[PDB]
């Protein structure tokens, strides 16, 4: 019956809005909820547990009112405001990339490295990993534990909702213009997205990979705490609204059969396994779900010790909001 | 200036219509062109080299009128009609999967194994390979010749046109209905395709891979004439109309840098290499092209001798009709 004051910073964004919904759905022990944003968003209303909560300016907010803050207002605002909330004694769970690679801040997937949460005392900050990494690592954890992983080839099928509402509107807007004869203009993306696949998520790096691809690499090795897992991504934007899917081709360190992995995955909490000719898809199975979906599990015929799988999740939920709320749950349970 | 009589069986399908256009565009030495189909689709006319050509019933066709036949009417009709055309002295180039794995029938990519065409004399039949395989092998051939290839990881981004006009109608259909509030009806694919990705093309095999996936394995091995090249595909249907893309992660037998592979490909005819922050996509670069497009060429950071690339082509053109017309060119040049 111990209750906590909770702030959500970025309350008017898809993830901030979903964090509220997930807090409500998972019946988090909240005494008071504060909703924070910039000045323009100030005065907007949302319902939490039956009561209207008003969005207030972060500039005017007294951080001492709060035990835990869930941040999802973009990297700039997290860099600016997280140290301030943390200085005030608030534990920040940060859904941006900003603190992920900072040497002493933990990067947590609760199904994977929940021990790392203990390192919240270093800076009063816990980093929430990238959506693609979260879902891949949840699916691969059982395999990693049983037999180890030497190398991951992964290609992604990423929805436009990763580029926020500017991406969603570009998809829906381009698609209507094209269908009704009008030309489609590009702004959020460098090429047309409607009825197209763009093999670029974020800017390029010196090595040919993009930042999104480089994030799956670095965040994987940090989270598994293993600088010897090799990760080889190609990240692609696809004309899908919500959910990300991944084709994962892994090389294990010891041999294991698809039947064993399927049994493990089925027994692991947070994983829904689809067998045989059934498999999850973004539109059909992923939308609105808090867990990770897998199918197409099979032995790699090209390698002595390989496993192939197909991984799907809702990138706004498990890929962000829900992962953060799950960190919060374990934080209050074991540290408060 | 020697001219040949050419038949197209399956003249009213997208590939058969494209075969006609390609024969014209490439100025193939045709004397008479015959267009063949069923009884239902007949009396229809097409323009070819400024002449009007009438579609006739295959059942009533005298095959002795023709030197070469291009087949794209489906596997069942090829099994029926190809042996008939062959016994009459016609050389059949078959764009179906039916004959591709017959030991006595050559499976040909003219950029890759042009010498196999000689095997046409076994049964008067040459097989045209799968579209996804064609574009992959054109891209990998120069790498294969330089340093060899031990293993390929590939995942595909495959357009609905791979499923004929039924697939196109289903995509254009569902997309319209959903943007106007009506539910999606799935009549063709195993799941909704509009705004979705489906990690299944063709029937599931007992090893867990789909037939499309096994084609990429077996046809690659046959065409490179190498049972030791390991191929690991995941084939995914995407909400795109024309062109196939592939994310290709190859392991070479000797180290090679991305700078050398890029130089080779750019110097290879039939390949358009995209450097830097430029890359080909389906909608923007693939549609209407007869060649293979590649970008994102970069060293694989996860492996000592790995190269990653992005490969795109028009599946109806270089992935079908164009490849078939290129076989026919070498056939008349070197064997007639």
Swiss-Prot record, chains A, B:
SMART domains: Semialdhyde_dh. NADP(+) binds at residues 12-15, 40-41, 161-162, 315. InterPro entries: Asp-semialdehyde_DH_CS, Asp_semialdehyde_DH, Asp_semialdehyde_DH_beta, NAD(P)-bd_dom_sf, Semialdehyde_DH_NAD-bd, Semialdhyde_DH_dimer_dom. Catalyzes the NADPH-dependent formation of L-aspartate-semialdehyde (L-ASA) by the reductive dephosphorylation of L-aspartyl-4-phosphate. Belongs to the aspartate-semialdehyde dehydrogenase family. Consists of two domains, an N-terminal nucleotide-binding domain and a C-terminal dimerization domain. This is Aspartate-semialdehyde dehydrogenase 2. It comes from Vibrio cholerae serotype O1 (strain ATCC 39315 / El Tor Inaba N16961).
